Design a protein around this ligand. Structure first.
Ligand SMILES: CC(=O)O[C@H]1C(=O)[C@@]2(C)[C@H]([C@H](OC(=O)c3ccccc3)[C@]3(O)C[C@H](OC(=O)[C@H](O)[C@@H](NC(=O)c4ccccc4)c4ccccc4)C(C)=C1C3(C)C)[C@]1(OC(C)=O)CO[C@@H]1C[C@@H]2O
Ligand SMILES: Nc1nc2c(ncn2[C@@H]2O[C@H](COP(=O)(O)OP(=O)(O)OP(=O)(O)O)[C@@H](O)[C@H]2O)c(=O)[nH]1
Ligand SMILES: Nc1nc2c(ncn2[C@@H]2O[C@H](COP(=O)(O)OP(=O)(O)O)[C@@H](O)[C@H]2O)c(=O)[nH]1
Ligand SMILES: [Mg+2]
Lengths: 428, 436, 619
């Protein structure tokens, strides 16, 4: 059981989903024809988490692709693994997004929700035990912010007990591929806080460094960044998919990582990561994986954990290892940099492990962290928003969809209330 | 699906209408006789041209444009030129008499009789499109048709659609070089009635592009075809996202939302790079860094406006060919480090960029070179008010003398439209100072 | 090393319309197989030359005039281009490999000039394309219409126009010279809606004849394409006209979808009663052949008449000699072939001259020295599995997809017995004791059973041996009493069958397809999904470990012969383990292999619907 339904919002969310659905399709050893050609029974025991049966021993992904302007949905359909998707799981509208949160959430969103919500339900009963949802966002654009959160609100009012994950990719502090970016960021934040349970934040910047220094990449394309996010997206559900001497469902990750109903913004990083050079020198040992993930580089979020304090943390390994090593490693670190952790939480880490490794490697890891340094991102965005709202720049677009200004006041107040909360439990 | 309507009014409008419609038919393999090789399903290529064409019941591709002009001599030339098998003669519109550099003659007396014909062809053309991205006007401020007819049209369009976006590339009367003498008047009269009806407005002048072909291309014999050859290159760079792929595709709605902060402030500038001949391309590597440097250069602008006396409210850069977005992120950072480049406070953002993998295509016998890269920039800066103010000075310099005004009041006008449009000039200008 | 002489191959591509061809003024018959083309001698039914260049399966076949090179279409998967291939003659190798028609190829034809080759897209992507032969490149292309066409034909003269017919449309297309276009002209028929299937053109482009699912044979003029005469008077073809051809004398051979093969003389006649009216086409001669007729090719004997090679949907090839002198039409059956997916092979014990093939419709019996199949015991609907000979020389056991076993004899007479509900559904493997006293049946719903059998009284005992998955194979020691059951879980189990207590043997790395004893030894050889030919110990061990489906051994353990999903056949010195004498060109997933005990012959059979014979030499 524990079936997982998947959403892919906006261009980026549609695009990283092309990799995540291409990596997993290989980890379980199926062909782009949809026919399984792996070797073991373990690929088939929990295959139900990401797929459905089909006629002729075929498996199709339980994914839903939503995007205005279906231009890009042709690309993934023309990609090498576009043949596996159910072409009725392609919901789109011809009119563009305009990078306006409003029409993405007031006018054009509303006209597609009825179709989407009909699709989501069409595969919610197909799950004998629906574990939870998971989405891929981008807060800068119009569809991702607008449609996703509007889609998110609809999910919560009909699936409240389940859990709403969010692989949201945030705007960048220094870079701005668009101009109205902070608006759609804050307007979504006013929606994520109240209709979500866990929300990882990731940013293209650290994604460029992690590509640059560690992997020694010269030309980081977009697929590679998504190739990374595909990895950490697969690193999460190894407990739901594969055996493990200490398994970890998502619902136990949430209760182990969020003490309060609103401190639910996370941070991620992958391990191991090495070029073709050092992999011929470096050895795979439990010590290797834990120092790399614990570092402040691999944090794909553009935040510095040293300026904050880890409320909680977690680690997801995979490969045959001595669990005692991992037991003491997290106990060593919890002692050395005792300032970066909190006091009223005695042991603030969860140490999971799985018995099945990645495909080509033999060991791997993944870091999660709920630090208060993530409030730094909300400080930057709250500045840019209040700078232009101080001048009502670009605002005629937003009131051009029935919107008002109180919403711009409300969303900012909530952002201030939020970042304040991450300061209370930050006693330096 | 993603289709636009390119209107060409006046003489210059139907001059650039030649170059662009020479460029487009070449990038897509469209032969002058409507068709192209491997046209049917044998080619396996669709959507590559629908933005600019309408495949017939079989084979031929008619360009979706409109040539409008009161002077019969030029429209009759295209009817005789090589590119006659392209245009359906319902598009090519003419008239017995011209406007003769009077606004009323283009706006009050003659224009009222042919606009209905124009609207009828547009309505014949609008219904053929499934998804209409936006109108694309090509005006030439400084004449009777352009100021007169274009302005009258935009009013008719807005009361028809309203919901549709309007976009226009209009050549403005240069400060120094002036082929006409009364162009200040109609220019004033054009600026107003377009403003409350156009949604965005790009501006550029021949004198600036006269230097461009001089400094960079190093040609000493510039004529109207060369300037129009460049405008072809500019717009092909813009529409590329509408009609091709590449990272960070942009449509007009996306492009327009993040470039117009306030309803009135929409007047913008332009620039292209690289601008080189065949031999310099041999002695050059064309890294994304230099190309984005020559882009923001105030010399390479296409209008005689100095942005170093104002602040960029926003910017938009459309690269082309082989670019990867780290480089854009890399180089755009470098600019934001510099000092000569100013921005108004309330926008910490300001860059809506875009890439397209399809290369820039050169025209045979043309002047530009074959390159794997290029950039076109469009910045809405508040420094644009200066050239808006020179004309503010030439109007009262003549309107005081009341020179040439008898033509206008004699052709079904009054003095009110001078004062009425005069105040809008000042009213606009102060808005360019309120943003400081 | 690949020394393995291919002595005989029996097979035929049945439902490939117009697939059968005769070499013009040649000594070869051309017809398709699972994925290959076969050129047999016209006379010596041994000299075969096969052409294998396709990946999935040949779909259409066209042969240009003057014995020049021939084109072959192909079916492919859902979203991957088809592959038209031009094969040279006088050299018998590939020339061009053209790719379009993303779903499949529907029709191909050469022009009278061998310079043009026209193709027709599949159900989807149905368009008409022209190809050049010097440059394997598409000259012209155009989509016909929504009602997808079925067949296309170049005009016998003026190789510049071609007629094509389909569901509710007929057109004549002329290739324009000024461009890369071809202009169609539609057919005008008076309030007639006919699903045209086959189309032929006369010698002089006067009249195009076109079959119909209704059964008519509409003849139309071609100067203007309008319609002229309906079809066969005094009745109507039963299953609609399918295989139509023209005899040089001006008449037409028509073969319907039931086996009715007749001759219609088509000369415009006036209606006797009403002078200004025409008659319908009469029928000179008529005959009945077995099965729906699908392909007709000509052979000019000219002594009395003409000999037409007629390929029927039942994979039978007929030689129809017709002489219009006395209007006499006599047919002969030259060669027969199985239908599709031959399931099981069987050899009678201590007999290396006759064998039996269980297929998806019924059981056929063949012999060694010649094809010359002996009999076909028919069971209408449900298919046979795992044919078996009762030991020492006795009845034939056959378990069917019904879940029932039935016994037949040599002449096989009437059913010896029917063990019904032998399993839940689809009994899959069947074996007998060395004493012919009990019969093992391993079903598809993961169960094994055994039935005691007396002389005229059957005994239905309740063994109920539970297994973990479908039983691919079941073997028993002819020396003593034991049992081995393979599985679609690979856990080959040794049953004792003295106490029926499942001697605890288990082999689990993947799921297996074929297991064999070493003759008079405690060894084992098993074959499953992963390439594994591991030698086991009967004493719970694995001597050695070296997509495979079928295994076989000689009298003693000399040469383990093997095959599988790969289209090859691997022979092995059993004790040494080298792959000497490997054979190729079995276009499909090979299913079974046999050794012909007394002699040195390896028979191979797969899902393609064919059977192959090789010699046997081991170092
Ligand atoms: C011979 C060998 O071991 O080569 C490795 C290899 O050298 C390295 C450099 C690999 C290699 O990865 C990269 O070079 C790379 C490039 C861009 C972005 C990310 C990685 C490798 O491509 C990656 C690949 O890893 C996998 O296949 C994982 O199982 C991974 N699979 C995919 O991402 C994948 C999916 C579909 C198709 C192809 C690859 C995975 C991760 C999470 C969950 C499931 C699967 C392997 C082992 C290797 C190569 C080929 C060099 C590394 O990546 C992974 C994912 O292991 C890069 O850092 C590691 C360290 C490895 O040593
Ligand atoms: N850059 C450039 N400018 C042009 C071109 N052709 C004309 N112009 C300018 O257009 C201006 C005059 O435009 P017209 O179209 O003749 O004016 P009008 O509105 O049609 O009114 P009439 O001239 O009476 O017909 C002049 O200043 C020209 O310099 C061209 O091909 N390229
Ligand atoms: N990791 C990754 N991020 C991308 C990719 N493409 C775009 N992004 C980011 O996605 C953001 C724009 O969101 P977008 O989906 O295009 O706008 P929307 O359609 O209105 O939601 C930009 O900040 C891009 O940088 C990609 O291919 N990979
Ligand atoms: Mg003029």
């Amino acid at each position: 059981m524990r079936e997982i339904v998947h959403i892919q919002g906006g261009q980026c969310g549609n695009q990283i989903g092309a990799k995540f659905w291409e990596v997993v399709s290989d980890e379980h050893g199926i062909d782009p024809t949809g026919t399984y050609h792996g070797d073991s029974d373990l690929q088939l025991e929990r295959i139900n988490v990401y797929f459905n049966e089909a006629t002729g021993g075929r498996y199709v992904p339980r994914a839903i692709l939503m995007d205005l302007e279906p231009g890009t949905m042709d690309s993934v359909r023309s990609g090498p693994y576009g043949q596996i998707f159910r072409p009725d799981n392609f919901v789109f509208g011809q009119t563009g997004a305009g990078n306006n949160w409003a029409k993405g959430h007031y006018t054009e969103g509303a006209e597609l929700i009825d179709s989407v919500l009909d699709v989501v339900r069409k595969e919610a009963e197909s799950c004998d035990c629906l574990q939870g949802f998971q989405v891929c966002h981008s807060l800068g654009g119009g569809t991702g912010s607008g449609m996703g959160t509007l889609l998110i609100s609809k999910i919560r009012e009909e699936y409240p007990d389940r859990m709403m994950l969010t692989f949201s990719v945030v705007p960048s502090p220094k870079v701005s591929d668009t101009v109205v970016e902070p608006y759609n960021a804050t307007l979504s934040v006013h929606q994520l806080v109240e209709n979500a349970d866990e929300c990882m934040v990731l940013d293209n910047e650290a994604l460029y460094d992690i590509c640059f220094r560690t992997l020694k990449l010269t030309t980081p394309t977009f697929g590679d960044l998504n190739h990374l996010i595909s990895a950490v997206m697969s690193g999460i559900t190894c407990c739901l998919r594969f055996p493990g001497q200490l398994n970890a469902d998502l619902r136990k990750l949430a209760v182990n990582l969020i003490p309060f109903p609103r401190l639910h913004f996370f941070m991620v990083g992958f391990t191991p990561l090495t070029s073709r050079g050092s992999q011929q020198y470096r050895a795979l040992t439990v010590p290797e994986l834990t120092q790399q993930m614990w570092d402040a580089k691999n944090m794909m979020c553009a935040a510095d954990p040293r300026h904050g304090r880890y409320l909680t943390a977690s680690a997801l390994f995979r490969g045959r290892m001595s669990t005692k090593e991992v037991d003491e490693q997290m106990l060593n670190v919890q002692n050395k940099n005792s300032s970066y952790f909190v006091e009223w939480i005695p042991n603030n880490v969860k140490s999971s492990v799985c018995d099945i490794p990645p495909k080509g490697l033999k060991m791997s890891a993944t870091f999660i962290g709920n630090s208060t340094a993530i409030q730094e991102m909300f400080k930057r965005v709250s500045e840019q928003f209040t700078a232009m709202f101080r001048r009502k720049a670009f605002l005629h677009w937003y009131t051009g969809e029935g919107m008002d200004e109180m919403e711009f006041t409300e969303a900012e107040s909530n952002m201030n209330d939020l970042v304040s909360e991450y300061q209370q439990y930050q006693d330096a | 699906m993603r289709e636009v309507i390119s209107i060409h009014i006046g003489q210059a409008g139907i001059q650039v209408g030649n170059a662009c419609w020479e460029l487009y038919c070449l990038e897509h393999g469209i032969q002058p006789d409507g068709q192209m090789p491997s046209d049917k399903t044998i080619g396996g290529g669709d959507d590559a041209f629908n933005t600019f064409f309408s495949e017939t019941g079989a084979g031929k591709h008619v360009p979706r444009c409109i040539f409008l002009d009161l002077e019969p001599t030029v429209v009759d030339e295209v009817r005789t030129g090589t590119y006659r098998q392209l245009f359906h003669p319902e598009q090519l519109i003419s008239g017995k008499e011209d406007a003769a550099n009077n606004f009323a003659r283009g706006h009050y007396t003659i224009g009222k009789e042919i606009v209905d014909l124009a609207l009828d062809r547009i309505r014949k053309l609008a219904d053929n499109c499934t998804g209409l991205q936006g109108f694309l006007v090509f005006n030439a401020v400084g004449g009777g048709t352009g100021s007169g007819l274009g302005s009258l049209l935009l009013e008719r369009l807005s009361v028809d659609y309203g919901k549709k976006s309007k976009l226009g590339f209009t050549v403005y009367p240069s400060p120094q070089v002036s082929t006409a003498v009364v162009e200040p008047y109609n220019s004033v009269l054009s600026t107003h009635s377009l403003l409350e009806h156009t949604d965005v407005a790009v501006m550029l002048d021949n004198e600036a592009i006269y230097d461009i072909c001089r400094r960079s291309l190093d040609i000493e014999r510039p004529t109207y075809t060369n300037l129009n050859r460049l405008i072809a290159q500019v717009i092909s760079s813009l529409t590329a996202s509408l009609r091709f792929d590449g990272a960070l595709n942009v449509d007009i709605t996306e492009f327009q939302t993040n470039l117009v902060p306030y309803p009135r402030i929409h007047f913008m500038l332009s620039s292209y790079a690289p601008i080189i001949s065949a031999e310099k391309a041999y002695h050059e590597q064309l890294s994304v860094a230099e190309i984005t440097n020559a882009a923001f250069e105030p010399a390479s602008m296409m209008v005689k406006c100095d942005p170093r006396h104002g602040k960029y409210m926003a910017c938009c850069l459309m690269y082309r060919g082989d670019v990867v977005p780290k480089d854009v992120n890399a180089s755009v950072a470098t600019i934001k480090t510099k000092r000569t480049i100013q921005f108004v406070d309330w926008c910490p953002t300001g860059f809506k960029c875009g890439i397209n993998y399809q290369p820039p295509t050169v025209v045979p016998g043309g002047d530009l070179a074959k390159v794997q890269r290029a950039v076109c920039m469009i910045s809405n800066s508040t420094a644009i008010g200066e050239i808006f103010s020179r004309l503010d000075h030439k109007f009262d310099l003549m309107y005081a003398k009341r020179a040439f005004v008898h033509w206008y009041v004699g052709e079904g006008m009054e003095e009110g439209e001078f004062s009425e449009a005069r105040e809008d000039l000042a009213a606009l200008e102060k808005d360019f100072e309120e943003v400081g | 090393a690949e020394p393995l002489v291919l002595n005989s191959v029996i097979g035929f591509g049945g439902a490939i319309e117009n697939g059968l061809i005769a070499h013009p003024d040649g000594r070869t018959i051309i017809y398709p197989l699972g994925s290959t083309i076969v050129l047999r001698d016209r006379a010596d039914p041994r000299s075969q030359e096969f052409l294998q260049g396709h990946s999935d399966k040949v779909s259409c076949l066209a042969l240009s005039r003057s014995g020049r090179y021939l084109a072959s279409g192909q079916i492919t998967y859902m979203g991957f281009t088809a592959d038209i291939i031009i094969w040279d003659l006088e050299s018998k190798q590939l020339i061009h490999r053209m790719a379009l028609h993303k779903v499949k190829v529907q029709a191909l034809d050469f022009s009278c000039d061998e310079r043009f080759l026209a193709s027709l897209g599949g159900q989807d992507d149905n368009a008409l394309v022209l190809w050049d032969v010097a440059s394997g490149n598409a000259i012209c292309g155009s989509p016909c219409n929504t009602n997808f066409t079925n067949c296309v034909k170049f005009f016998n003269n003026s190789p510049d126009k071609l007629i094509t017919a389909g569901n509710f449309n007929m057109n004549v297309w002329t290739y324009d010279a000024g461009n890369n276009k071809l202009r169609p002209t539609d057919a005008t028929l008076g309030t007639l809606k006919r699903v045209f299937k086959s189309v032929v053109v006369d010698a002089n482009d006067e009249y195009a004849y076109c079959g119909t699912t209704t059964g008519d044979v509409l003849q139309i003029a071609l100067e203007r394409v309008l319609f002229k005469n309906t079809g066969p008077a005094k009745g109507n073809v039963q299953m609609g006209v399918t295989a139509t051809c023209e005899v040089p004398t001006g008449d037409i051979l028509v073969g319907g979808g039931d086996g009715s093969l007749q001759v219609l003389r088509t000369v415009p006649e006036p209606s006797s009663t009403n002078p200004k009216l025409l008659r319908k086409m009469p029928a000179l001669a008529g005959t009945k052949v077995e099965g729906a007729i699908t392909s007709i090719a000509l052979a000019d004997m000219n002594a009395r008449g003409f000999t037409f090679f007629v390929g029927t949907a039942m994979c039978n090839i007929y030689k129809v000699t017709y002489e219009p002198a006395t209007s006499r039409l006599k047919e002969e059956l030259v060669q027969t072939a199985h239908n599709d997916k031959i399931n099981g092979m069987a050899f009678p014990n201590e007999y290396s001259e006759v064998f039996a093939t269980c297929g998806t419709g019924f059981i056929r019996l063949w012999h060694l020295t010649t094809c010359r199949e002996l009999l076909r015991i028919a069971v209408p609907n449900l298919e046979c599995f795992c044919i078996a000979f009762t030991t020492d020389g006795s009845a034939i056991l056959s378990g069917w997809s019904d879940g029932k076993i039935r016994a037949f004899g040599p002449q096989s007479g009437k059913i010896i017995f029917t063990i019904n509900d032998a399993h839940q559904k689809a009994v899959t493997a069947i074996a007998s004791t060395a004493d012919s006293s009990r019969i093992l049946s391993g079903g598809e719903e993961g169960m094994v059973r055994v039935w005691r059998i007396g002389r005229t009284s059957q005994t239905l005992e309740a063994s109920m041996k539970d297994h973990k998955g479908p039983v691919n194979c079941i073997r028993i020691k002819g020396s003593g009493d034991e049992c081995v059951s393979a599985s679609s879980d690979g856990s080959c189990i040794l049953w004792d069958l003295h106490t029926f207590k499942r001697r605890t043997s288990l082999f689990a790395n993947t799921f297996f397809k074929s297991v064999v004893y070493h003759p008079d030894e405690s060894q084992l050889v098993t074959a499953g999904t992963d390439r594994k030919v591991t030698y086991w110990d009967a004493y719970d061990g694995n001597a050695i470990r070296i997509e495979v489906n079928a295994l076989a051994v000689d009298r003693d353990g000399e040469a383990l012969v093997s095959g599988g999903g790969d289209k090859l056949v691997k022979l092995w010195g059993y004790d040494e383990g080298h792959c000497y004498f490997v054979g190729v060109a079995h276009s499909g997933a090979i299913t079974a292999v046999g050794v012909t005990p007394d002699k040195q012959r390896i028979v191979s059979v797969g899902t393609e619907g064919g059977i192959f014979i090789w010699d046997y030499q081991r170092p």
